[PDB]
């Protein structure tokens, strides 16, 4: 499975630019899919999503009425269409698959990434850490922190954990607190009470350094939160 | 909507595959269904032929009308517990050879009668149409000239020429239909190099089709 | 000749064994507790989407989703709380009479006229479910098949015989033949090490997995035993056969205990099921509607009307929450 | 056919029982032992129900 | 003579909306919506339900000779009479020709008659009357007062209405059912033995008698219309097209085989 990202580069603010990704490796007709952009210091911020045979269309209140995601399910192929590119679009936008079953695990697989410079009741996610200095073979807790509640009446806490090594997209160790990932070491852990979240690593490798991010799925637009580096 | 993002997005999962077993049983209701019946040496290997382990399905179209057969005569197991897996079937193709009236495997024709005559009463089978064939209709004509027809009916007494002893075997294999009055049978007499069979299948099944949309209208 | 007699004698031999271990009836026994006053349960979950008789039914493991086959060539995973389509598998041949949940949740099973078992993988690096074995080596239809783990199955066929297979190589490792009707039905052990199998010769045999040869047979019944099924403790089981009759059999008594039957009832039954606790015994029959009998005192505590066909399947949950029953009107019902 | 026949019955008369007041006393304490773990047997409140 | 027009206005009010309920009730209790037939039967029990609702006001204004209920009740009132109208008679002409699509052209209907294309037929004829209705009570307006379309105008209104309510449906009934008939003939199952024989005179009684009740309910109203164009006989007439409606559904449900088979 691999989703390859095209488009990008130099735009003159104002202007416009149609980003594609090309899905290859998986039955991309029954995923939704999303736009997730990432400033170039900064960290994640999710753009849009489009649904499994384009029935539902979400954008963020920084891009609604601007942005104009699409799909083309019999060519595999998703489109964001951005019209007056402001100059706070540039970005490095990952295309990610997310399908919506029970017991499914959205927001799994994250694209390459596409680079885009143009010249010159929301729930808040707060990651208070940053910058914390680890050694091989320890113990590391990253916290977080929610404006709201992200349990639910049925029971789900949609609370995602994703790991962003240095140079490569973001991937998910966690999909819902305590419920791990596939392809990742047991060692990662998810937990959490209420509103505040842990993830935790009993002993880490070299491989695991990186910046840690929380998501929320409880409602849109789907509030990311602020980067948690790991230095060796 | 008292529902997550998440919990939503399933839902339209689960509408989007309703749509899809919708439009695959709409497919499915326009298409007919046959149930081939018969013996070992009755014959329906040229029969399947013609109109062209585990049970065989065959598939074919003839005059915008898409056809399945259900070959089944593999499954040498007992009948009683899979013969209500074709209970709602347009009809059943049953094969007889008529050349087979002096041999033995206990004489063919006897089996073929009394298969047939289990199998048109059967209880899941109490309205399907029947299609009757009796195949190898030259061999017939070449056996009957030499041996007389009162080798399998003693009490036949009747002129020993092709047209009338094969009207006598059809007559008896009818008169096997218990209670005549909401099934046909349609009986035809083929041969191996005969191509009118198809025909004859789609004008039953045509006939068979109005009866069931004038019961679905309400007006029998 | 000489063995037959001696055939003879070893049968009269085991019914005088049997006779004697009679030491009393589980009726009298049970005739001195106060039974089960009224059971009512009502439809607490319609499931629709199949557009042909449903033939099969099998919970999770988790008891919240489960697995029905159909004969539109139809394999459905229902989220029983939401009611709602997780999977919709299409099957290669439509004529399946069997499928089965796998109890890791990664797997289901399925299979019928076509004489092959086939198994689905639920959770593919891809979106959707595919087969990943198709097990061919029986010459009968495929009545039952029970995931013994991720990668042992057993099913039964028609051919008078059952198998145990390897699914990561396709071959059958084991092969049960010692019935002379078709087998129609299969039950897992709690703890799956043996399984009971019910015949089209009124009889149903015990089977050992590990040794791989018949280890008990039982004769109570006049026709077909469509259904069979354990008792949650393991050492009972419970036949549903073509007389309109129930008997639970018991493995060390090695006799039948209690008849489950009535004058009003004269249609087979098509599948059984127990409660958690083993009290209540849920079947199947083929007048449109299930009943519910006190296992303990064979009293009909209650009947699941509500169907518009004959009741093919019938399970209940791991948890003993809801009783889910399948039938040939093409819908599945929920009850608690 | 018949000697392994003969040979089934064999084993199978070979088998040790036990008596059937003993089995329906099993059985009867089992029902007994999970009877309060048993939602058909008596519903439950509809706050504890999952289908409701 | 009042008091019994009176009374028969009533007996055919109630009949009509007790049988309308009844078939409804079964419709989508005692037997499922599948199949066109259905969802058809459905339809035209609803629309004369309406029309059977709307007949006491004719029988108050028969009663009082005079309008009580205003401008603002006159104009949804005879809107929804029209509408009411129009959907009986276009839903009657619709199970005509699927009756006549089953019959004689059953591969054809094989894709043609699924209960989704049925639905797709009903929204279009109701949409259709909407049309109508939204055309009459642009102009149904009210100007002893009685109550009427405000506008040769009305000349032409009452030419369309005729033409459009009972020369065409009554053909293309009449064509359909004669060519049905004909085809059932010409059928093997049906033209065989004494009771296949039987069978099929059957099905040409009740054709027959479902016709023939059309014709002889809508006629004389018609013809009232256009003679007078060109007080007790119009609204005997008129009572005599509100009969039609209310005893369609009667011979619908206790005529239908699906009826007969559930009870
Ligand atoms: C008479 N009529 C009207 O629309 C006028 C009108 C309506 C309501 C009231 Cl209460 C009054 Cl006083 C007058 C229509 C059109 C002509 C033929 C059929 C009539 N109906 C349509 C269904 C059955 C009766």
Known sequence: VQLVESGGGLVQPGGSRKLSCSASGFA????????????????????????????????????????????????????????????????????????????????????????????????????????????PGESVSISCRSSKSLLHSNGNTYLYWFLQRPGQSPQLLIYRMSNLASGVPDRFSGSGSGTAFTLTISRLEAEDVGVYYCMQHLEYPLTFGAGTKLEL | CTLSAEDKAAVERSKMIDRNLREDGEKAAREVKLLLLGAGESGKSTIVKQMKTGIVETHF??????????????????????????????????????????????????????????????????????????????????????????????????????EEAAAYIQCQFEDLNKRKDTKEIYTHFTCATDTKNVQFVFDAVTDVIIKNNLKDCGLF | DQLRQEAEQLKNQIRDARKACADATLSQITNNIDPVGRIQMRTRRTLRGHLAKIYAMHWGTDSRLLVSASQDGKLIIWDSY?????????????????????????????????????????????????????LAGHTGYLSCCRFLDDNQIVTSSGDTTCALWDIETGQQTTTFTGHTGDVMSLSLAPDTRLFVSGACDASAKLWDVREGMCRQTFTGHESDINAICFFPNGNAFATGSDDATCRLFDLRADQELMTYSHDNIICGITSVSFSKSGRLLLAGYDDFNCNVWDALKADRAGVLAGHDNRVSCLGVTDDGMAVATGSWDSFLKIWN | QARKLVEQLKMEANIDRIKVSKAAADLMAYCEAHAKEDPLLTPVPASENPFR | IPVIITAVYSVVFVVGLVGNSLVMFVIIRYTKMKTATNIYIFNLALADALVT???????????????????????????????????????????????????????????????????????????????????????????????????????????????????????????????????????????????????????????????????????????????????????????????????????????????????
């Open chain 1, 28 to 135: 991309f007709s029954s995923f939704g899919m999303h736009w997730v952009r990432q400033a170039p210091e900064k960290g994640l911020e999710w753009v849009a999503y489009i649904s499994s045979g384009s029935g539902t269309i979400y954008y963020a209140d920084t891009v609604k009425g601007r942005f104009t995601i699409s799909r083309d399910d019999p060519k595999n192929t998703l489109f964001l269409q951005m019209t007056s590119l402001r100059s706070e679009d540039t970005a490095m936008y990952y295309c990610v698959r997310s399908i919506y079953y029970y017991g499914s695990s959205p927001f799994d697989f994250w694209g390459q990434g596409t680079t885009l410079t143009v010249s010159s009741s929301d729930i808040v996610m707060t990651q208070a850490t940053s910058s914390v200095p680890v050694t």
């Open chain 2, 61 to 162: 179209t003839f005059k915008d009308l898409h056809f399945k057969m259900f070959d089944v005569g593999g499954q040498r197991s007992e009948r009683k517990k899979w013969i209500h897996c074709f209970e709602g079937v347009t009809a059943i193709i049953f094969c007889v050879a008529l050349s087979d009236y002096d041999l033995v495997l206990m004489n063919r024709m006897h089996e073929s009668m009394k298969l047939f005559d289990s199998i048109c009463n059967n209880k899941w089978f109490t309205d399907t149409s029947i299609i009757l064939f009796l195949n190898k209709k030259d061999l017939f004509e070449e056996k009957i000239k030499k041996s007389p027809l009162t080798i399998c009916y003693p009490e036949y007494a009747g002129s020993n020429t092709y």
């Open chain 3, 82 to 134: 939401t009611t709602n389509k997780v999977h919709a598998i299409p099957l290669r041949s439509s004529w399946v009479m069997t499928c089965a949940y796998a109890p890791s949740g990664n797997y289901v099973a399925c299979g019928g006229l076509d004489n092959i078992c086939s198994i689905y993988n639920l959770k593919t690096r891809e979106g959707n479910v595919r087969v990943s074995r198709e």
């Open chain 5, 53 to 263: 609702t709307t007949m006491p006001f004719q029988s108050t204004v028969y009663l009082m000779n005079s309008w009580p209920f205003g401008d603002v009740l006159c104009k949804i009132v005879l809107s929804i009479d029209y509408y009411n109208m129009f959907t009986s008679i276009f839903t009657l002409t619709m199970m005509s020709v699927d009756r006549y699509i089953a019959v004689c052209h059953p591969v054809k209907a094989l894709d043609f008659r699924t209960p989704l294309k049925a639905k797709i037929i009903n929204i279009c004829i109701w949409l259709l009357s909407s049309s109508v209705g939204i055309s009459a009570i642009v102009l149904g307006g009210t100007k002893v007062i009685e109550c009427s379309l405000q506008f040769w105008w009305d000349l032409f209104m009452k030419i369309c209405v005729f033409i459009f309510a009972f020369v065409i449906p009554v053909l293309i009934i009449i064509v359909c059912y004669t060519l049905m008939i004909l085809r059932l003939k010409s059928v093997r199952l049906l033209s065989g033995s004494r009771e296949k024989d039987r069978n099929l005179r059957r099905i040409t009684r009740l054709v027959l008698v479902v016709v023939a009740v059309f014709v002889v309910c809508w006629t004389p109203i018609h013809i009232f219309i256009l003679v007078e164009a060109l007080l007790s006989s119009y609204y005997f007439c008129i009572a005599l097209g509100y009969t039609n409606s209310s005893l369609n559904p009667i011979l619908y449900a206790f005529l239908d085989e699906n009826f007969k088979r559930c009870f």
